[PDB]
Design a protein around this ligand. Structure first.
Ligand SMILES: *CCC(=O)Nc1ccc(-n2nc(C)c(-c3c(C)ccc4n[nH]cc34)c2C)cc1
Ligand SMILES: Nc1nc2c(ncn2[C@@H]2O[C@H](COP(=O)(O)OP(=O)(O)O)[C@@H](O)[C@H]2O)c(=O)[nH]1
Ligand SMILES: [Mg+2]
Ligand SMILES: [Mg+2]
Length: 168
Protein backbone atom coordinates (compact mmCIF):
# COMPACT_ATOMS: atom_id res chain seq x y z
CA UNK A 1 0.00 0.00 0.00
CA UNK A 2 1.50 3.35 -1.11
CA UNK A 3 1.59 6.05 1.58
CA UNK A 4 1.16 9.73 0.49
CA UNK A 5 1.82 12.90 2.50
CA UNK A 6 -0.74 15.60 1.63
CA UNK A 7 -0.53 19.19 2.88
CA UNK A 8 -3.59 21.53 2.98
CA UNK A 9 -2.53 25.19 2.55
CA UNK A 10 -4.39 28.48 2.18
CA UNK A 11 -5.22 31.76 3.85
CA UNK A 12 -6.77 32.00 7.37
CA UNK A 13 -10.48 31.21 7.33
CA UNK A 14 -10.74 29.51 3.88
CA UNK A 15 -11.87 26.14 5.31
CA UNK A 16 -8.61 24.18 5.58
CA UNK A 17 -9.72 22.42 8.79
CA UNK A 18 -13.36 22.10 7.71
CA UNK A 19 -12.39 20.28 4.50
CA UNK A 20 -9.95 18.00 6.36
CA UNK A 21 -12.46 17.12 9.10
CA UNK A 22 -15.17 16.42 6.48
CA UNK A 23 -12.84 14.00 4.68
CA UNK A 24 -11.73 12.20 7.89
CA UNK A 25 -14.73 12.29 10.30
CA UNK A 26 -17.61 13.11 7.89
CA UNK A 27 -18.89 16.18 9.74
CA UNK A 28 -18.81 19.95 9.23
CA UNK A 29 -17.15 22.00 12.00
CA UNK A 30 -18.30 25.61 12.25
CA UNK A 31 -15.89 26.91 14.91
CA UNK A 32 -12.58 25.02 14.48
CA UNK A 33 -9.80 26.56 16.62
CA UNK A 34 -7.65 28.48 14.08
CA UNK A 35 -4.37 27.64 15.85
CA UNK A 36 -4.64 23.84 15.78
CA UNK A 37 -2.21 22.30 13.29
CA UNK A 38 -2.73 18.52 13.05
CA UNK A 39 -1.96 15.44 10.92
CA UNK A 40 -4.69 12.85 10.06
CA UNK A 41 -4.42 9.37 8.56
CA UNK A 42 -7.01 7.73 6.29
CA UNK A 43 -6.97 4.67 4.01
CA UNK A 44 -8.88 5.26 0.73
CA UNK A 45 -9.46 3.53 -2.63
CA UNK A 46 -8.80 5.73 -5.64
CA UNK A 47 -9.14 4.31 -9.14
CA UNK A 48 -9.08 0.76 -7.76
CA UNK A 49 -5.84 1.25 -5.80
CA UNK A 50 -5.61 1.72 -2.03
CA UNK A 51 -3.39 4.41 -0.54
CA UNK A 52 -2.78 5.56 3.02
CA UNK A 53 -3.17 9.34 3.17
CA UNK A 54 -1.33 11.35 5.79
CA UNK A 55 -2.87 14.84 5.63
CA UNK A 56 -1.34 17.92 7.34
CA UNK A 57 -3.91 20.62 7.97
CA UNK A 58 -1.71 23.77 8.33
CA UNK A 59 -2.29 26.59 10.82
CA UNK A 60 -0.09 29.17 12.78
CA UNK A 61 1.22 32.63 11.87
CA UNK A 62 1.83 34.29 8.50
CA UNK A 63 5.60 34.13 8.96
CA UNK A 64 8.71 32.55 7.54
CA UNK A 65 9.69 29.49 9.51
CA UNK A 66 12.70 27.33 8.66
CA UNK A 67 10.76 24.54 10.54
CA UNK A 68 7.69 25.02 8.27
CA UNK A 69 10.03 24.60 5.22
CA UNK A 70 10.92 21.17 6.78
CA UNK A 71 7.25 19.96 6.90
CA UNK A 72 6.66 21.42 3.45
CA UNK A 73 9.67 19.66 1.93
CA UNK A 74 8.29 16.26 3.09
CA UNK A 75 4.85 16.99 1.56
CA UNK A 76 4.28 15.07 -1.69
CA UNK A 77 1.16 16.98 -2.82
CA UNK A 78 -0.59 20.19 -1.83
CA UNK A 79 -4.14 21.51 -1.83
CA UNK A 80 -4.05 25.23 -2.58
CA UNK A 81 -7.25 26.35 -0.93
CA UNK A 82 -9.05 29.68 -1.48
CA UNK A 83 -12.61 30.71 -0.56
CA UNK A 84 -14.88 31.97 -3.45
CA UNK A 85 -16.11 35.02 -1.42
CA UNK A 86 -12.57 36.24 -0.48
CA UNK A 87 -10.51 37.61 -3.43
CA UNK A 88 -7.52 38.15 -1.15
CA UNK A 89 -7.33 34.36 -0.47
CA UNK A 90 -7.34 33.72 -4.29
CA UNK A 91 -4.61 36.42 -4.82
CA UNK A 92 -2.70 34.68 -1.97
CA UNK A 93 -2.53 31.34 -3.96
CA UNK A 94 0.42 32.64 -6.07
CA UNK A 95 2.47 33.35 -2.93
CA UNK A 96 1.63 29.89 -1.52
CA UNK A 97 2.73 28.18 -4.80
CA UNK A 98 5.97 30.23 -4.90
CA UNK A 99 6.76 29.10 -1.31
CA UNK A 100 6.08 25.41 -2.07
CA UNK A 101 8.20 25.69 -5.23
CA UNK A 102 11.04 27.42 -3.32
CA UNK A 103 11.24 24.73 -0.63
CA UNK A 104 11.06 21.83 -3.11
CA UNK A 105 13.55 23.50 -5.66
CA UNK A 106 11.21 22.46 -8.50
CA UNK A 107 8.40 23.81 -10.69
CA UNK A 108 6.35 20.52 -10.84
CA UNK A 109 5.09 19.64 -7.40
CA UNK A 110 1.64 17.85 -7.40
CA UNK A 111 -0.95 20.52 -6.52
CA UNK A 112 -4.72 21.03 -6.81
CA UNK A 113 -6.38 24.46 -6.76
CA UNK A 114 -9.45 24.26 -4.46
CA UNK A 115 -12.33 26.76 -4.55
CA UNK A 116 -13.99 26.29 -1.19
CA UNK A 117 -17.31 27.66 0.16
CA UNK A 118 -19.07 26.95 -3.19
CA UNK A 119 -22.38 26.67 -1.27
CA UNK A 120 -22.35 30.45 -0.58
CA UNK A 121 -24.44 32.56 -2.95
CA UNK A 122 -22.04 35.51 -2.36
CA UNK A 123 -19.18 35.18 -4.84
CA UNK A 124 -16.23 37.49 -5.55
CA UNK A 125 -13.88 35.06 -7.38
CA UNK A 126 -15.23 34.04 -10.80
CA UNK A 127 -14.91 30.34 -11.81
CA UNK A 128 -13.27 31.43 -15.11
CA UNK A 129 -10.49 33.24 -13.10
CA UNK A 130 -9.81 30.08 -11.09
CA UNK A 131 -10.04 27.79 -14.17
CA UNK A 132 -7.54 30.06 -16.01
CA UNK A 133 -5.17 30.20 -13.00
CA UNK A 134 -5.16 26.38 -12.64
CA UNK A 135 -4.73 26.20 -16.46
CA UNK A 136 -1.55 28.39 -16.45
CA UNK A 137 -0.22 26.43 -13.42
CA UNK A 138 -0.83 23.07 -15.19
CA UNK A 139 -2.92 21.73 -12.28
CA UNK A 140 -6.58 20.63 -11.74
CA UNK A 141 -9.08 23.00 -10.10
CA UNK A 142 -11.81 21.47 -7.79
CA UNK A 143 -14.87 23.44 -6.50
CA UNK A 144 -15.79 22.34 -2.97
CA UNK A 145 -18.01 23.05 0.03
CA UNK A 146 -16.86 21.70 3.38
CA UNK A 147 -20.41 22.61 4.59
CA UNK A 148 -22.38 20.41 2.17
CA UNK A 149 -19.49 17.91 1.50
CA UNK A 150 -19.61 18.88 -2.28
CA UNK A 151 -16.32 18.03 -4.06
CA UNK A 152 -14.55 17.17 -0.75
CA UNK A 153 -13.49 13.56 -1.59
CA UNK A 154 -12.92 14.82 -5.19
CA UNK A 155 -10.35 17.47 -4.18
CA UNK A 156 -8.26 14.93 -2.14
CA UNK A 157 -8.64 11.95 -4.63
CA UNK A 158 -7.64 14.32 -7.48
CA UNK A 159 -4.52 15.38 -5.52
CA UNK A 160 -3.67 11.65 -5.11
CA UNK A 161 -4.08 11.13 -8.91
CA UNK A 162 -1.63 14.04 -9.41
CA UNK A 163 0.95 12.46 -7.05
CA UNK A 164 0.59 9.08 -8.77
CA UNK A 165 1.12 10.72 -12.18
CA UNK A 166 4.23 12.63 -10.91
CA UNK A 167 5.87 9.51 -9.36
CA UNK A 168 5.82 7.44 -12.57
C1 LIG B 1 -5.64 31.31 10.30
C2 LIG B 1 -4.61 30.18 10.50
C3 LIG B 1 -3.87 29.92 9.25
O1 LIG B 1 -4.53 29.50 8.30
N1 LIG B 1 -2.55 30.25 9.22
C4 LIG B 1 -1.62 30.13 8.15
C5 LIG B 1 -0.29 29.95 8.51
C6 LIG B 1 0.72 29.87 7.56
C7 LIG B 1 0.42 29.93 6.21
N2 LIG B 1 1.48 29.91 5.36
N3 LIG B 1 2.08 31.02 4.90
C8 LIG B 1 3.11 30.73 4.22
C9 LIG B 1 4.01 31.70 3.53
C10 LIG B 1 3.24 29.27 4.31
C11 LIG B 1 4.36 28.45 3.71
C12 LIG B 1 4.19 27.60 2.60
C13 LIG B 1 2.81 27.43 1.94
C14 LIG B 1 5.28 26.86 2.09
C15 LIG B 1 6.56 26.98 2.63
C16 LIG B 1 6.71 27.81 3.74
N4 LIG B 1 7.84 28.08 4.44
N5 LIG B 1 7.51 28.97 5.42
C17 LIG B 1 6.28 29.31 5.38
C18 LIG B 1 5.64 28.55 4.24
C19 LIG B 1 2.21 28.86 5.05
C20 LIG B 1 1.93 27.44 5.45
C21 LIG B 1 -0.90 30.25 5.82
C22 LIG B 1 -1.92 30.32 6.79
N1 LIG C 1 -20.46 28.27 4.29
C1 LIG C 1 -19.29 27.68 4.38
N2 LIG C 1 -18.50 27.91 5.36
C2 LIG C 1 -17.25 27.21 5.48
C3 LIG C 1 -16.93 26.29 4.57
N3 LIG C 1 -15.65 25.84 5.04
C4 LIG C 1 -15.39 26.44 6.12
N4 LIG C 1 -16.35 27.28 6.42
C5 LIG C 1 -16.40 28.21 7.54
O1 LIG C 1 -15.39 29.24 7.46
C6 LIG C 1 -14.68 29.43 8.69
C7 LIG C 1 -13.20 29.03 8.52
O2 LIG C 1 -13.09 27.62 8.40
P1 LIG C 1 -11.76 26.84 8.87
O3 LIG C 1 -11.83 25.41 8.50
O4 LIG C 1 -11.66 27.18 10.42
O5 LIG C 1 -10.67 27.75 8.11
P2 LIG C 1 -9.08 27.46 8.20
O6 LIG C 1 -8.57 28.67 9.07
O7 LIG C 1 -8.65 27.79 6.72
O8 LIG C 1 -8.67 26.16 8.82
C8 LIG C 1 -15.43 28.57 9.74
O9 LIG C 1 -16.33 29.40 10.49
C9 LIG C 1 -16.18 27.52 8.89
O10 LIG C 1 -17.44 27.19 9.45
C10 LIG C 1 -17.82 26.05 3.44
O11 LIG C 1 -17.49 25.24 2.58
N5 LIG C 1 -18.96 26.79 3.41
MG1 LIG D 1 -7.60 25.57 10.54
MG1 LIG E 1 0.81 19.53 -14.31
Amino acid sequence: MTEYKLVVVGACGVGKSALTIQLIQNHFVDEYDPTIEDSYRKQVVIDGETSLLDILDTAGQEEYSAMRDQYMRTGEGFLLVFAINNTKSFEDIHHYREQIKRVKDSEDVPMVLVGNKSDLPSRTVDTKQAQDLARSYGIPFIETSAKTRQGVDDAFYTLVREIRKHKE
